[PDB]
Amino acid sequence: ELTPDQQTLLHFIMDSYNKQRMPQEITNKILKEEFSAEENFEILTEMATNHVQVLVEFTKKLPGFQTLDHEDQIALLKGSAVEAMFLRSAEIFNKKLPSGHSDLLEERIRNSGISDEYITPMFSFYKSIGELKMTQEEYALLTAIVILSPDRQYIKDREAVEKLQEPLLDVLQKLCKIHQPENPQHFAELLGRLTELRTFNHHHAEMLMSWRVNDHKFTPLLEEIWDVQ
Amino acid sequence: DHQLLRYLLDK
Numbered sequence: 240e241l242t243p244d245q246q247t248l249l250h251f252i253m254d255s256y257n258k259q260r261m262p263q264e265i266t267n268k269i270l271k272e273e274f275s276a277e278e279n280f281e282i283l284t285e286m287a288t289n290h291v292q293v294l295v296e297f298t299k300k301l302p303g304f305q306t307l308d309h310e311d312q313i314a315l316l317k318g319s320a321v322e323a324m325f326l327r328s329a330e331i332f333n334k335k336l337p338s339g340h341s342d343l344l345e346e347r348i349r350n351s352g353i354s355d356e357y358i359t360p361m362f363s364f365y366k367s368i369g370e371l372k373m374t375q376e377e378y379a380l381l382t383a384i385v386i387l388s389p390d391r392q393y394i395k396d397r398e399a400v401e402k403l404q405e406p407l408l409d410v411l412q413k414l415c416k417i418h419q420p421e422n423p424q425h426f427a428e429l430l431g432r433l434t435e436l437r438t439f440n441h442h443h444a445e446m447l448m449s450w451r452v453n454d455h456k457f458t459p460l461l462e463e464i465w466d467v468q
Numbered sequence: 469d470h471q472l473l474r475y476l477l478d479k
């Protein structure tokens with residue numbers, strides 16, 4: 240029972256989900272460039288920074304985001320940075336998005352200084368989330384949800400964030416009943432990943448440490464969003 | 469602190 244109030248909300252999101260765009264010339268460098276542990280990393284870093292901007296343009300265009308406190312706005316962007324990125328890269332591999340270059344993106348990730356300890360689960364996650372046969376709506380809606388998660392660290396006004404997430408979560412459950420009546424547990428499967436994503440946030444802190452000790456410059460934007468001295 | 473994010477929102 241998709242109400243018009245919600246039919247408009249989702250449409251705003253899905254248009255934004257195609258509106259803030261990653262340039263082709265940049266992502267072409269996943270295919271174009273040489274395949275070495277040095278180059279693979281340089282490329283992956285380039286992709287990330289460009290994506291961090293795309294996520295900030297997207298997050299800005301989320302309904303009721305700009306009305307939030309300027310101080311909290313950072314803490315959310317900061318907290319959901321990796322998770323949103325993990326969610327978008329999962330969509331690359333799962334739905335095989337042409338401009339993402341899944342197979343070659345996978346070659347670079349698998350040879351960029353990352354430990355087997357963090358590669359195995361990272362790709363186990365990609366496989367399992369793939370098997371959910373997720374739609375562009377379900378991808379776009381989770382993103383909005385992960386960004387606006389009230390239980391991030393260093394937040395003050397979590398009730399105002401709760402007011403922004405609830406609206407999305409309601410709309411998502413509706414879509415899990417509409418397009419997935421066969422299985423009523425589908426809304427729970429989507430929420431299950433929100434928890435899976437969190438575990439990778441911990442993994443990511445250790446991943447960044449490994450690169451640092453092996454002399455791997457990131458970027459002032461990433462170093463800000465993740466905190467890198 | 470955190471200039472670039474603040475800047476990205478205001479821009």
Ligand SMILES: Cc1cccc(C)c1-c1noc(C(C)C)c1COc1ccc(-c2ccc3cc(C(=O)O)ncc3c2)cc1
Pocket residue numbers: 260261266280283284286287290320321324325327328331336337338339348457461
């Ligand atoms: C290795 C890793 C896995 C998961 C999450 C992270 C933050 C990392 C991770 N952790 O560190 C790094 C860097 C610092 C080495 C990464 C690399 O992250 C990314 C993030 C985004 C993308 C990416 C690629 C193609 C895109 C195409 C399009 C489009 O066609 O519309 N849109 C967005 C796209 C974004 C690639 C790597």
